[PDB]
């Protein structure tokens, strides 16, 4: 009896563990994909060098 249980449940849990692994992976490449599209946003877009001097000069100020 215990063996039947363990084995079935084991087959079931496999699907979850798998499903879980897929999600994780994908959402790795997904949030990581963010990186390479934002390193493309600043390196490119010369209009993302203006939004540079911007937010940053708002540093000196506040602190003081």
């Amino acid at each position: 009896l215990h063996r039947v249980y363990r084995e079935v449940k084991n087959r079931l849990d496999y699907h979850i563990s798998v499903q879980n692994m897929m999600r994780q992976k994908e959402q790795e490449h997904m949030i990581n994909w963010v990186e390479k599209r934002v390193v493309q946003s600043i390196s490119a877009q010369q209009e993302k060098e203006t939004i540079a001097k911007c937010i940053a000069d708002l540093k000196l100020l506040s602190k003081k």
Partner: protein, 60 residues
């Protein structure tokens, strides 16, 4: 539910020839082993939350 012919052990001790004490010993321990075992091994296993699994699947 099991039937289990009741057993007084000191009598059992007193009916084994010496050249057979070995056997009798092993017979005793197996019993004890076996008993301990059933104390811990439940009649049936836990059920299986089928709804839950049904709730998290992918193959139909």
């Amino acid at each position: 539910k099991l039937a289990l012919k009741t057993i007084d052990w000191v009598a059992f001790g007193e009916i084994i020839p010496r050249n057979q004490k070995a056997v009798a010993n092993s017979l005793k321990s197996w019993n004890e082993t076996l008993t301990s075992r059933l104390a811990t091994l439940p009649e049936k296993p836990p059920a299986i939350d089928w709804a839950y699994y049904k709730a998290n699947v992918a193959k139909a």
